[PDB]
Assembly symmetry: D2
Homo-oligomer: 342 residues x 4
């Protein structure tokens, strides 16, 4: 029975605490936050064994097998390292690190300490994204993939820390692009990136990028687009399309739930937009891949089943983003090494 | 740990076998079919303790707690009765019985032997339908519901038994209408039916009805339509809509998965239509309510949690359909008692 | 050059005045209203030769060839009769009459006076509805039609006269059902109705019906549903579906324009709903059939081209509705004669 | 009454012949093709005064006011120049020329002979695109536009000339991108392009580009994407999206007609895909802007109303594409001048 600690009792600590509490092979043992009242509230809401106010004590406790780190991006590296050095398995929310060297250091650490290190690429475990991938891999029907495009857009993160470079490590390219890049590479069966090209925008007034376009060229000829935004009103969008020589596949997460509703006022449990025509969500957590993700991690820890989607995939995506940031700066298409293609 | 037997190893025996194998609080203990090879196929597919070729032996086995009956409609009554008499809890695929009196007999019989009896109204446990019901029940936004329409259409059941009245008990109204009626009533929080009106069609050549429209009037003023069909090409359709004084809600099961795909050939695990633009399914079983339904039944048996959706609801729907059949015959709007309005 | 008079300078007088002013084979000659200022305003907005304040003078004027009657339903019969007796051709907005006998009287009148009588069934001239009909008539692909359903729903007519039985002649079944019935019969190539069954509701508090369902059985075996409503919020809906032994055809007028837009505030030229996700309209008048309709009528008058969709179709639909009203009262399925089927 | 000659009696000569025949202020006077039988087919189809087998005779005929040029891209320049020199007004299908200098030469040449020169940017006259532009321009609701994306994809041009560089002048970027670029600029009210960046692909075997992505940066901060493809099965796609600080607008031409149909066979007048679920078209020609475009040109010629969308816009787009081609070669983001950013 895998004894789990949640580190950061905010929004994603809550999502993970829910899926942990529901999983028969695990126990929600502890919740820790710098804000001890936020840890207590979440420990209560999901019936955790306890609130643990001390990081040091949490790490020394031999009753904890796995920590889930849901703190602000810029803390991920230090927290995960300390955790792995203390002997704990770790699931870290994306971004696993804020630079490829941060990520590489964690992977090497996890290997040295013989620990499972997993990162929070949940969409890659979304049942509807899994399906879409089988369809593209059905060569008879789809043929050879030549385009993949993944779009993540919303009206921007609300938490104050996501506005500072030291706490967030980057703007929209890092926050949403990490996911878009992973989904492109993974929809094409782990395709190798040969070049990266990107351009960033600052749409909101005075500074982190709040919208970006990043494009990858892959070994086989295919081209991937990642189009991400913190400045799109009207409801979060997560879509993908893949186009091959013979077929097409389209995926829609938030307006492909098969529910529509209309009201003047606004429905009680309905997000944003509030009023008028909306697309209410059912089982958003599962549809988004969190149950399957966390389940994989609980199994990897509980019985050394290797992860299907490892942290090496986080290194590859970190390299892509870092190169995207450079491509924007230099206004050219770059190899992952940083060299210009020409 | 609830020990489960599946009776009828065809399409729905397969669906229930999968959800049973996946449920931690249960064990797929046996599979039985008149065709012992089909039972063995399925027992293997889902790692059942055994294939049980003998109905008698299956019923006497004190290791089974619950049977799930996925045989042709006309057998449901006898099989469920024998099962309850043998001390087993029972989940019966819809229709629970072929007439209200068959259903009432089983409920009473389950009472006598102190057994859980459940019926396979899966859509009422569909996470997306549960959500749609909360939105309708959100009075400030939805206002008062005044219309509900549920549409079930497909190109018709392929099995030969579903073409015979003796084995099927009825045509599309009984087959698909039972679901549509339960969803209308349940979307409106168990609304009381005041009248029923229906017309049936025979579209494909010489005979059971192929297509039907059934309309309920409810106590509060709302009207429910159930529009069902065995003669609709182009992919199964399961949709609902609810309209209130202030809102609307629309529910779409099979073309509201957020996946589209195109090919000339046809994709390996994609149903019907085969070719051209299709809407592939993800997690169809869960989306359709089977995991939550069976879960409820496993919990009712395992730890005496009462069912949220009991077999009395199958009685209410059976009465509705029976009155719909009579409405069609007499060409008039009837009370459940059978009297004309 | 067909010289046209518009009678009733309200909403539909405005729609018709627009299409008349645009048509090269016609001239918007006069506009008449009991409210002479409403006639003047419309005469100006569309450059009519004049505002004609006198009905009698309008009818005696030998310079007018065709009157378009866009007054309240309950005036249609008397106005159209007087017009035809005076020697004028007439297009009457639906409902052409409020009972089958009103309609029959007008048809007989039009024949006696050798005049074109047309009624305002515009959807039957909607280019997208025309297409849908060819697809159903493509027997190879569609097979034999066995179901047709037409849905008209909105939040109800705003004009005061539509709330009185004397001025409106009926509630939603008459107002919206007339159109739904015509589209069902016409989508199936003028199919003969054998039985009618209907039920009406009064949803709004205290009285005319504000929602209805009417079902027709046709000669060939097919069944038609007309589902109409004055109590559906969230935007007007006009849809149809047809299902055959081999095929299906679906038509959507107001959410099948291929435009979507989102705003918090509301866009300047956008209807209802105002805010949030909307489906703005482009060329709604043409998409709805009014240009083609009126064009047919202008040609029938201008050069005795017979109407493709005649007033006999209004008699057939009037009979259907009248029988629907009776079916509701008696709670049974009736033949057009009024007899019960049994 | 504007007397019109159509030059090139293939697919677009057919489209323009239909809108010309239907326009009251014009007459379809002649149709000319290298294939005199194709010219005659079309002259008959649309009741043209005559089939004119001779280019020279067509140009000398003082009865023609306007020629519409619907020949292969590489001929546009020579044909339009000869036509303007012969005193005729000219509407040239896109691309107006194959290089910015070809386009600039024609504009200047039209000026010299005091002639209307128009190019076939039809989507910019599409009633639905015109509407989408008003919504974006509605500042209180939309706020400031910061993204525009236009997508044009199909399974590729079938004619052999469109596979040759000499006859086509370029691959998918020139063919489909010209439209996508004009729509981005025009949706943002004639926005000034500050930079261009593009990458091209060759998807189908050995060669002109099959698929491309071109991205503009605009003066105000907004970014435009043009995503074009000859290698997309499953039906032509023409869509756009615009996103502002407060709103979004989405435009869909071919799957936003409000018609769906299913058959196994295929419906008589339905394009591609043939079978299964399709989106049949109604009034495609009007929806695509051809009636309004040609109307504008007929009015410009007939009664000296200036064009709303002039050939200078074809120069701006030609510069963009030429810089996109260079961007792809050099693998960097370029100013229109050709300089790197
Ligand atoms: N996969 C996905 O879809 C999503 C991932 N995320 C990621 O999840 C992570 C957390 O996101 P949320 O929206 O922020 O939560 P958040 O802002 O709601 O809360 C973070 C919590 O961490 C606590 N905290 C801050 N620093 C701490 C420290 N050094 N030690 C212990 N506790 C600390 C705060 O008091 C707060 O309770 C982020 O890294 C973000 O990238 C966020 C949303 C969705
Ligand atoms: N909830 C839902 O959505 C659906 C429910 N159903 C229902 O499920 C039930 C089974 O339908 P399907 O699985 O489609 O049928 P099926 O034809 O796929 O299989 C029925 C099986 O029962 C076997 N059988 C026949 N007589 C038997 C006997 N005396 N004892 C044991 N087995 C016998 C047959 O050999 C066959 O394998 C029906 O009552 C039907 O109404 C069917 C489809 C969908
Ligand atoms: N085909 C279609 O889609 C539609 C048809 N309609 C129909 O069009 C007709 C008119 O509808 P609108 O919404 O009402 O216009 P409305 O209410 O806006 O105006 C009617 C006009 O008639 C004038 N008027 C009333 N009685 C008159 C009389 N005896 N003589 C001269 N003028 C008179 C009024 O002052 C007013 O200006 C109705 O019959 C309705 O059924 C209405 C909307 C859409
Ligand atoms: N606006 C739009 O949406 C579209 C525009 N186009 C454009 O329209 C133009 C024509 O394309 P399509 O009609 O698809 O071509 P097509 O291949 O259908 O026909 C072109 C015709 O020109 C004829 N021709 C060849 N050389 C000639 C000459 N020297 N003199 C006279 N005629 C000659 C050919 O025989 C052929 O009939 C192209 O410039 C293309 O870029 C094409 C498709 C869509
Ligand atoms: N206004 C709608 C929602 O906006 C925030 O939450 C969304 C999350 O932000 C969203 O995640 C995306 O957005 C976050 C902010 O950009 C990213 O840090 C994250 O990587 C991405 O998947 C989840 N998949 C869906 C959540 N509902 C907000 O935190 C929620 O409380 C709220 O329900
Ligand atoms: N709130 C949206 C609209 O509601 C009314 O107008 C609609 C009209 O009412 C609508 O017609 C339907 O509704 C009318 C009212 O029920 C019926 O009398 C008519 O037979 C039917 O086609 C038109 N086809 C489309 C019009 N936009 C209203 O008159 C308009 O000014 C307004 O644009």
């Amino acid at each position: 029975p895998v004894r789990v600690g949640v580190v950061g009792a905010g929004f994603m600590g809550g999502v993970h605490a829910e899926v942990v509490a529901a999983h028969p092979g695990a126990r929600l043992e502890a919740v820790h936050d710098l804000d001890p009242a936020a840890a207590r509230d979440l420990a209560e809401r999901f019936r955790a064994e306890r609130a643990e106010p001390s990081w040091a004590d949490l790490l020394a406790d031999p009753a904890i097998d796995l920590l889930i780190i849901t703190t602000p991006n810029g803390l991920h590296h230090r927290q995960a390292a300390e955790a792995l050095r203390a002997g704990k398995h770790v699931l870290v929310e994306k971004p696993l690190g804020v630079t490829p060297e941060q990520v590489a250091e964690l992977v090497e650490l996890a290997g040295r300490h013989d620990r499972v290190l997993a990162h929070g690429s949940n969409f890659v475990h979304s049942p509807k994204f899994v399906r879409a991938r089988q369809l593209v891999a059905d060569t008879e029907a789809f043929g050879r993939p030549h385009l993949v495009r993944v779009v993540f857009r919303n009206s921007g993160p609300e938490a104050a820390w996501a506005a500072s470079k030291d706490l967030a490590g980057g703007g929209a390219l890092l926050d949403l692009g990490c996911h878009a890049v992973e989904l492109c590479r993974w929809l094409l069966d782990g395709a190798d990136v040969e070049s990266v090209s990107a351009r960033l925008q600052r749409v909101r007034p005075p500074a982190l990028e709040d919208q970006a376009l990043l494009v990858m060229e892959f070994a086989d000829g295919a081209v991937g687009q990642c189009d991400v935004s913190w400045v799109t009103q009207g409801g979060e969008q997560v879509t993908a399309e893949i186009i091959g020589t013979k077929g097409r596949v389209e995926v829609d997460l938030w307006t492909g739930m098969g529910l529509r509703a209309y009201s003047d006022k606004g429905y009680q449990d309905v997000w944003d937009p509030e009023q008028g025509w909306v697309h209410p969500e059912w089982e958003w957590i599962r549809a988004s891949g969190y149950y399957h993700q966390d389940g994989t991690v609980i199994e990897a820890v509980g019985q050394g089943i290797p992860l299907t989607h490892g942290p090496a995939e986080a290194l590859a995506s970190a390299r892509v983003l870092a190169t995207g940031y450079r491509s924007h700066a230099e206004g050219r298409v770059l190899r992952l090494s940083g060299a210009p293609v020409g």
